[PDB]
Short mmCIF file of C-alpha atoms in Angstrom, two decimals:
data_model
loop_
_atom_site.label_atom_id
_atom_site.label_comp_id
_atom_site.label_asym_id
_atom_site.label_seq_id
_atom_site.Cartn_x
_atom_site.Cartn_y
_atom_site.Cartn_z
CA UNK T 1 22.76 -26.36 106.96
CA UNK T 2 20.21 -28.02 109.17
CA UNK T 3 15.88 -28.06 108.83
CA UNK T 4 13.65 -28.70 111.98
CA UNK T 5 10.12 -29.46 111.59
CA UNK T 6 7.04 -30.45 113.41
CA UNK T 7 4.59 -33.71 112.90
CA UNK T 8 1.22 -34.03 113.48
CA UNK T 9 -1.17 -37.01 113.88
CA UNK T 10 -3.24 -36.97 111.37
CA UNK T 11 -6.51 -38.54 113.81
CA UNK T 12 -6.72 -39.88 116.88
CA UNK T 13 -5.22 -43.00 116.36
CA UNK T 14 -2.02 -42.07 115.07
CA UNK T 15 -2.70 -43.70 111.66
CA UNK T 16 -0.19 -41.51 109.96
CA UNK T 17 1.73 -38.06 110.50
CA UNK T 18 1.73 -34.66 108.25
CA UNK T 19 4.70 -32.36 107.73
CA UNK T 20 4.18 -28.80 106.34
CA UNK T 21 6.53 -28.48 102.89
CA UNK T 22 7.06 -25.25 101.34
CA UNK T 23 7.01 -26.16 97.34
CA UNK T 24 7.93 -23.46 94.61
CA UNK T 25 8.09 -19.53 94.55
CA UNK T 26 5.95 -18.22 96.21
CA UNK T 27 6.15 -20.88 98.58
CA UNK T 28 3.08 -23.44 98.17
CA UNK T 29 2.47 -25.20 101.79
CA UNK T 30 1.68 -28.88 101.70
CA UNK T 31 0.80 -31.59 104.32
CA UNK T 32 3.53 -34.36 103.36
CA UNK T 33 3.48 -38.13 104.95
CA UNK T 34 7.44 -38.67 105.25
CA UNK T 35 7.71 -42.20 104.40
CA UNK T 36 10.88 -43.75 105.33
CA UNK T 37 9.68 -46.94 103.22
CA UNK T 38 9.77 -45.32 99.52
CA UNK T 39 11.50 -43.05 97.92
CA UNK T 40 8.97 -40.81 95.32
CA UNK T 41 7.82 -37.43 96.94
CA UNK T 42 4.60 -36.96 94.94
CA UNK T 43 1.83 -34.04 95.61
CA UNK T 44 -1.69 -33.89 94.25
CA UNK T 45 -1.68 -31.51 92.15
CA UNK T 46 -3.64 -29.14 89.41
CA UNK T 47 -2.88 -32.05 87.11
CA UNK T 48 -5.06 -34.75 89.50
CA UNK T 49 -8.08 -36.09 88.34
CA UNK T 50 -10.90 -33.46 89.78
CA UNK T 51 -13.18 -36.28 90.84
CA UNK T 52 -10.41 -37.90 92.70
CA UNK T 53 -9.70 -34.81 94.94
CA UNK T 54 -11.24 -34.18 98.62
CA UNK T 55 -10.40 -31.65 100.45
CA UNK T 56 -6.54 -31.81 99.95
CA UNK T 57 -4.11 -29.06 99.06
CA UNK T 58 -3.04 -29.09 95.69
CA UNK T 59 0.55 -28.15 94.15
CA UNK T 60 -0.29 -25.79 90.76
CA UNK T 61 3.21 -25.64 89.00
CA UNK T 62 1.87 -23.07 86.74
CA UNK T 63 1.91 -20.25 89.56
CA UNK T 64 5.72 -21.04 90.86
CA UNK T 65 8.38 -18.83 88.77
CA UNK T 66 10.72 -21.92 90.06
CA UNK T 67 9.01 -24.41 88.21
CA UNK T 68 10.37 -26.68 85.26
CA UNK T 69 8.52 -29.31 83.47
CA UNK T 70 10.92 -32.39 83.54
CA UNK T 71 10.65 -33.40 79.64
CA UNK T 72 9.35 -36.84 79.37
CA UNK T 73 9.30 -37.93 82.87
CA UNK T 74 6.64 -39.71 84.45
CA UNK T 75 6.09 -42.20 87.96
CA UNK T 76 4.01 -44.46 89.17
CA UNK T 77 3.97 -46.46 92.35
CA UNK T 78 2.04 -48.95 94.52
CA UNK T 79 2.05 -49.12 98.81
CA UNK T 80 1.93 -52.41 100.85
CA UNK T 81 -1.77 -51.51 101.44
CA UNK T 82 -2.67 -52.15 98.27
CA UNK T 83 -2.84 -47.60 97.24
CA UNK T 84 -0.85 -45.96 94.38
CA UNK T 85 -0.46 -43.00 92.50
CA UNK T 86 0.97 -42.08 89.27
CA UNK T 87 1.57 -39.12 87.15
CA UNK T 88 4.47 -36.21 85.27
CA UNK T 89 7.17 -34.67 87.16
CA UNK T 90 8.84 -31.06 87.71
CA UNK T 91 11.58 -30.11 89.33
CA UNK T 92 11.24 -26.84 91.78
CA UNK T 93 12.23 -25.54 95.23
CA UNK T 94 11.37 -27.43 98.30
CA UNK T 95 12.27 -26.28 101.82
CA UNK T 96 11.67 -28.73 105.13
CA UNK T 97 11.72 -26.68 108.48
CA UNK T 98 14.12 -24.12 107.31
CA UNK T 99 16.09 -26.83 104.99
CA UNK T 100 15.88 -25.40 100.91
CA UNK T 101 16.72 -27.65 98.28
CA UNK T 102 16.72 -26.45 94.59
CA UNK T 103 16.28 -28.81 91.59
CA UNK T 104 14.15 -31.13 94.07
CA UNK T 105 12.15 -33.90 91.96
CA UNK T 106 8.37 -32.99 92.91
CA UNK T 107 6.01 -35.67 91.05
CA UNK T 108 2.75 -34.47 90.26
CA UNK T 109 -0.11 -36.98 90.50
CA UNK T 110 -2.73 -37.19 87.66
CA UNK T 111 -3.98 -40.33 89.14
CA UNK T 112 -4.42 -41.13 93.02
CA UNK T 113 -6.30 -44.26 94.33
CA UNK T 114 -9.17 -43.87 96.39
CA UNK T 115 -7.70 -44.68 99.71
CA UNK T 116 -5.75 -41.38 99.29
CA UNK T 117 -8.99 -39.45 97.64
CA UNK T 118 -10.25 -40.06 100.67
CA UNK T 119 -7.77 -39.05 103.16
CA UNK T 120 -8.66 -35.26 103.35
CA UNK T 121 -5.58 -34.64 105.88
CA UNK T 122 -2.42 -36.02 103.50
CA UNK T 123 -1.48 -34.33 100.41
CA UNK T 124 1.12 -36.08 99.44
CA UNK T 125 4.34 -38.17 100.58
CA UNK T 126 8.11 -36.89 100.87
CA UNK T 127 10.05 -40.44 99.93
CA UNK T 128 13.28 -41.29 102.72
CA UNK T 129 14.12 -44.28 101.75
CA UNK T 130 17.10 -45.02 99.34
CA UNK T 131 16.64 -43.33 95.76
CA UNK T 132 17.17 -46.71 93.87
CA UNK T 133 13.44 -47.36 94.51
CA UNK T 134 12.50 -43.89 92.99
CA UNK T 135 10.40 -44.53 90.24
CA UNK T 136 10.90 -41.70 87.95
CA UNK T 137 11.65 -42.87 84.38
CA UNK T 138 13.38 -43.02 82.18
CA UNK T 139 15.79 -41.10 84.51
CA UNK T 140 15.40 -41.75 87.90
CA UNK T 141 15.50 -39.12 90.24
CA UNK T 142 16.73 -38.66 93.68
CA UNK T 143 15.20 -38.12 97.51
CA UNK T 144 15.14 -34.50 99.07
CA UNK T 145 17.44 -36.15 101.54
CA UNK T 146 19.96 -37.88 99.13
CA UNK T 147 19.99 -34.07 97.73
CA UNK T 148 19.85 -32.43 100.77
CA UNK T 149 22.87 -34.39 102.20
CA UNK T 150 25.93 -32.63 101.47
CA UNK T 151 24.99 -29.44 102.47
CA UNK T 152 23.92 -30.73 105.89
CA UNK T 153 26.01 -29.98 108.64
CA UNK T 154 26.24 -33.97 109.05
CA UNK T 155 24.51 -36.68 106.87
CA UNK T 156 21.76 -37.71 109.14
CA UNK T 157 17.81 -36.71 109.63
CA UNK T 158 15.68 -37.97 112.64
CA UNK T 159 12.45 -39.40 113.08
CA UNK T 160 10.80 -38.25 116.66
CA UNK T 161 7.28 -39.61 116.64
CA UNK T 162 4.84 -38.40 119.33
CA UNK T 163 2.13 -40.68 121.00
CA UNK T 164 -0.93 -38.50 120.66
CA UNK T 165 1.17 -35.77 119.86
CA UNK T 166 3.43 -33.73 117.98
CA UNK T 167 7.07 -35.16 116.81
CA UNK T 168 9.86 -33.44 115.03
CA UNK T 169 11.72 -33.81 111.92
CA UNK T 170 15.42 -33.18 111.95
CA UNK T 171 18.01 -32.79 109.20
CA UNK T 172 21.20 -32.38 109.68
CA UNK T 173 21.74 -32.60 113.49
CA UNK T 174 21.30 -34.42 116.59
CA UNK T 175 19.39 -33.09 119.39
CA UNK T 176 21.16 -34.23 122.25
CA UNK T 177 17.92 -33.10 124.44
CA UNK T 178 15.34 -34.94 122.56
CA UNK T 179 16.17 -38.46 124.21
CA UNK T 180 17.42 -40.36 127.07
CA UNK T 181 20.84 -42.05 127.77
CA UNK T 182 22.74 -42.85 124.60
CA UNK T 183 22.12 -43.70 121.02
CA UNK T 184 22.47 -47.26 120.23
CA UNK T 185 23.56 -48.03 115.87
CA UNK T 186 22.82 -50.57 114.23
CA UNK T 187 24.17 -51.80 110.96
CA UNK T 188 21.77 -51.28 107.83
CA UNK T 189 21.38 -53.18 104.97
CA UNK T 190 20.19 -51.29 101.41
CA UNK T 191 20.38 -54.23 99.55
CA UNK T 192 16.08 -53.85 98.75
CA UNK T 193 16.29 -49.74 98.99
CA UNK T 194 14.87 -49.75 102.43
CA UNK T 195 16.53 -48.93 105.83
CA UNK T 196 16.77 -52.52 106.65
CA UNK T 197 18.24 -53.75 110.04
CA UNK T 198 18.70 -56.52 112.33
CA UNK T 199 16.90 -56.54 115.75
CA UNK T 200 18.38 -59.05 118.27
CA UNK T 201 15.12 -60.12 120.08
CA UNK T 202 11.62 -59.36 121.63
CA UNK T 203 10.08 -59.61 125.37
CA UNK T 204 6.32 -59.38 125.94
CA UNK T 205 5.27 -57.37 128.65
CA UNK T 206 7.45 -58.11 132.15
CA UNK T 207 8.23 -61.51 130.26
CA UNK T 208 11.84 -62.92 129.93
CA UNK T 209 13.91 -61.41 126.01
CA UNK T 210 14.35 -63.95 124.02
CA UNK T 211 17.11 -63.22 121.65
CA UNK T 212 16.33 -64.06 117.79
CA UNK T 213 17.24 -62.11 114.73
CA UNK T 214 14.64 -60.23 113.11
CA UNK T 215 15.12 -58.48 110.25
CA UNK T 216 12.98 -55.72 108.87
CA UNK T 217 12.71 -52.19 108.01
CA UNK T 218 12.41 -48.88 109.92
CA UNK T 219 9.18 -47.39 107.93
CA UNK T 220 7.55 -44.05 109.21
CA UNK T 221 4.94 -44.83 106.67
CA UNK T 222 3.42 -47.81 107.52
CA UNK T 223 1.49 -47.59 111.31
CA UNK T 224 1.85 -51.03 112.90
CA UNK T 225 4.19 -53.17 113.76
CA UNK T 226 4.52 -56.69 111.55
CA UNK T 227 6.54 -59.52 112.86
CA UNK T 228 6.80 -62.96 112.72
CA UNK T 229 3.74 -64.83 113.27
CA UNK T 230 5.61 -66.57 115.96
CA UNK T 231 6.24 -63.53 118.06
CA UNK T 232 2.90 -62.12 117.36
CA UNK T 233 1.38 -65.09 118.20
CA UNK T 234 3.47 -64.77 121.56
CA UNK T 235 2.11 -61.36 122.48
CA UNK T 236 -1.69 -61.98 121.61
CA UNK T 237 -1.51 -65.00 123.93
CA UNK T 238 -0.89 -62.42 126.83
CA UNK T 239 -4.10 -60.53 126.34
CA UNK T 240 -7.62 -62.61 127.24
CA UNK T 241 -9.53 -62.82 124.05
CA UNK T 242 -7.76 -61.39 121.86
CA UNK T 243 -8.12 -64.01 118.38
CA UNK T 244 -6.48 -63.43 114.98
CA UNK T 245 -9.74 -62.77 112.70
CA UNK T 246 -9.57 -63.32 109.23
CA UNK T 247 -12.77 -61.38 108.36
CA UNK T 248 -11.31 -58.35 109.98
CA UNK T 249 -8.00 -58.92 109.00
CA UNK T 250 -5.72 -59.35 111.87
CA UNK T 251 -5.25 -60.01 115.56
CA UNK T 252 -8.59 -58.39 117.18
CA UNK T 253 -9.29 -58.02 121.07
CA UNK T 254 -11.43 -56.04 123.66
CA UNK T 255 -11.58 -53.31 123.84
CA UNK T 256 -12.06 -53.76 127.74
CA UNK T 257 -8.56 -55.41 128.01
CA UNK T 258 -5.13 -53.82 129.33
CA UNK T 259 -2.66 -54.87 126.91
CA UNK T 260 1.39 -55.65 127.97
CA UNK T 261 3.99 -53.76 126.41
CA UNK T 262 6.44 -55.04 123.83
CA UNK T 263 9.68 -54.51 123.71
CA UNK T 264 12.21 -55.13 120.94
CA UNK T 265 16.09 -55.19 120.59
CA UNK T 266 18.46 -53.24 119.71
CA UNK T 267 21.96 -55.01 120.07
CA UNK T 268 22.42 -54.62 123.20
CA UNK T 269 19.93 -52.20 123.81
CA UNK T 270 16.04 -52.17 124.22
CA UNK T 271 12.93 -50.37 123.17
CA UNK T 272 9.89 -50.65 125.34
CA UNK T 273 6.78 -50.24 123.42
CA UNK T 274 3.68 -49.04 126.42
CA UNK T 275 0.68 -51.36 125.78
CA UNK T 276 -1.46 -48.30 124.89
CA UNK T 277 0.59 -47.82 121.91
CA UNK T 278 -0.83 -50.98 121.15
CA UNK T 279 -4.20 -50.66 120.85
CA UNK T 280 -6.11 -48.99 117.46
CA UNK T 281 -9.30 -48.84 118.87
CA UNK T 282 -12.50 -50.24 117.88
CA UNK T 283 -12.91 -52.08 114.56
CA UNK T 284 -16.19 -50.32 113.87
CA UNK T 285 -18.01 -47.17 114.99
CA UNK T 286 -18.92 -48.52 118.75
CA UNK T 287 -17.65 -51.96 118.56
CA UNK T 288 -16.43 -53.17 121.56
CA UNK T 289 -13.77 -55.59 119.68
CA UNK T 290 -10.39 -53.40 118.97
CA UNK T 291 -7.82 -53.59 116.49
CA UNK T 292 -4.20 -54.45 117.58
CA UNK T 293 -1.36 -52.40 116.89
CA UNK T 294 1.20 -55.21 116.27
CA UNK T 295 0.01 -57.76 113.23
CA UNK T 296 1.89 -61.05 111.86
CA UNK T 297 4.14 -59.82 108.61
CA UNK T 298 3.65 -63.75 107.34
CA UNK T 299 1.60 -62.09 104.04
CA UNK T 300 3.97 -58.80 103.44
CA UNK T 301 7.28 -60.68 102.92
CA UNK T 302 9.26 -58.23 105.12
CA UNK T 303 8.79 -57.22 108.68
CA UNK T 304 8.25 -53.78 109.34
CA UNK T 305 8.82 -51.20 112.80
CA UNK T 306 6.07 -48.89 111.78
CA UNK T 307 5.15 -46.16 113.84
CA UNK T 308 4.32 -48.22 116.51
CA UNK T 309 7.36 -48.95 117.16
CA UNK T 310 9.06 -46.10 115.90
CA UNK T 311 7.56 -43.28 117.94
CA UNK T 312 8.52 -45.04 121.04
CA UNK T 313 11.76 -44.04 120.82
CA UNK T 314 14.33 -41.53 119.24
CA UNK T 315 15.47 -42.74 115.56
CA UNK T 316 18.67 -41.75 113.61
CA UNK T 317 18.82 -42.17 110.11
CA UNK T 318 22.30 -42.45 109.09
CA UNK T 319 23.10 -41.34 105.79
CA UNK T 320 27.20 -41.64 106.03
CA UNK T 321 29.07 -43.84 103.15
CA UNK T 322 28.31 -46.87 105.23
CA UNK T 323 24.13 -45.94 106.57
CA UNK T 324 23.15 -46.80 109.91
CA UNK T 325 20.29 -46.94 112.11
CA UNK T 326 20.49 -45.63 115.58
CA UNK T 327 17.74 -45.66 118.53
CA UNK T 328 17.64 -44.23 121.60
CA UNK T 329 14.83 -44.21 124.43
CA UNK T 330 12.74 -41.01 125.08
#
């Protein structure tokens, strides 16, 4: 079997992307941030707290014929950015662009934070990273891909992010036509849960690569880019004015400015970030300071190839006995 499926920008900055899930019978339609960095898919729900609800679409377990309480279950889990979300869990029938899986772990929230109360546009997340960070207990449970898997017609999905625009979703197939030249892999690492790889250097804008190991994660669900503060601190220094404010949080710059692109390794292979990918507008309603797109990792622990990085090119996630990463140029 294969699934196909479209992403969508949730604003115009590309904060985040939305795929449409079909959950129970009859099919309920959700708006689901795939999140290559954890492994829970949780909805909100007829079980979330009313007052924490805005505008999302809500999973009611009570109107799908496919639904069964799991006895006992429960999850809870806190993002990078400081959100979480916690609640019970069923198991029903989820289907991904065509893709049905039955028995799929679908954890309802009774508690969201407010950064996702107020996020009309995302109703949940569909976890893709490795199911030993699920945190269903006592029993924890696995990903819709990890179940999805061996009925695939191979053991792979794809991330195609769009700049501005639409992406896809693939399981189960390669679409030769989606990228240019070849498909370079990578060797992964799921030592913490995460895709984790090893990129062999950077080069700032027409600048020379320098070649240094940098290890991080391939994450669809974080939106910038966080490396070493000595390679951020490389690429800031290329763009007049731009300053690392701790009041705002991060490496600011005007808005007025052209910024370089970025490009990072691949073994031998290279991803070229454009400079507009770069830039996450102003800080403020009408500032004329602007937020950058790549950010110094020194206070997360891990780097991470968000979306900025991600959506320029064509990613494979490799789910064979040994996982790998692959990444192409689009």
């Amino acid at each position: 079997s294969t699934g196909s499926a479209t992403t969508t920008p949730i604003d115009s900055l590309d904060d985040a992307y939305i795929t449409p899930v079909q959950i129970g019978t009859p099919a309920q339609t959700l708006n689901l941030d795939f999140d290559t960095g954890s492994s829970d898919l949780w909805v909100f729900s007829s079980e979330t707290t009313a007052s924490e609800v805005d505008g999302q679409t809500i999973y009611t377990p009570s109107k799908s014929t496919t639904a069964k309480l799991l006895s006992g279950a429960t999850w809870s889990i806190s993002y990078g950015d400081g959100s979480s979300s916690s609640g019970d869990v069923y198991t029903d029938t989820v289907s991904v662009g065509g893709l049905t899986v039955t028995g799929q772990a679908v954890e309802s929230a009774k508690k969201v934070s407010s950064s996702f109360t107020e996020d009309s546009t995302i109703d949940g997340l569909l976890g893709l990273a490795f199911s030993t960070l699920n945190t269903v207990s006592p029993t924890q449970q696995k990903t819709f891909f990890d179940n999805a898997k061996a009925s695939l017609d191979s053991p792979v999905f794809t991330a195609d992010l769009g700049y501005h625009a639409p992406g896809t979703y693939n399981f189960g197939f390669i679409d030769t036509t989606a990228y240019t030249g070849s498909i370079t892999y990578t060797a992964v690492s799921t030592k913490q849960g995460f895709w984790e790889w090893t990129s062999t250097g950077y080069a700032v804008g027409s600048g020379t690569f320098k070649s240094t190991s940098i290890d991080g994660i391939a994450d669809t669900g974080t939106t910038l880019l966080y490396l070493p503060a000595t390679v951020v601190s490389a690429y800031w220094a290329q763009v007049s004015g731009a300053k690392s404010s701790s009041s705002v949080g991060g490496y600011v710059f005007p808005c007025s400015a052209t910024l370089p692109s970025f490009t990072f390794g691949v073994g031998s292979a290279r991803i070229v970030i454009p400079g507009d990918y770069i830039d996450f507008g102003p800080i403020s309603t009408g500032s004329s300071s602007c937020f950058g797109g790549i950010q110094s990792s020194a206070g997360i622990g891990i780097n991470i190839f968000g979306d900025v990085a991600l959506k320029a090119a064509f990613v494979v996630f490799n789910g064979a006995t040994t996982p790998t990463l692959g990444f192409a140029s689009k």
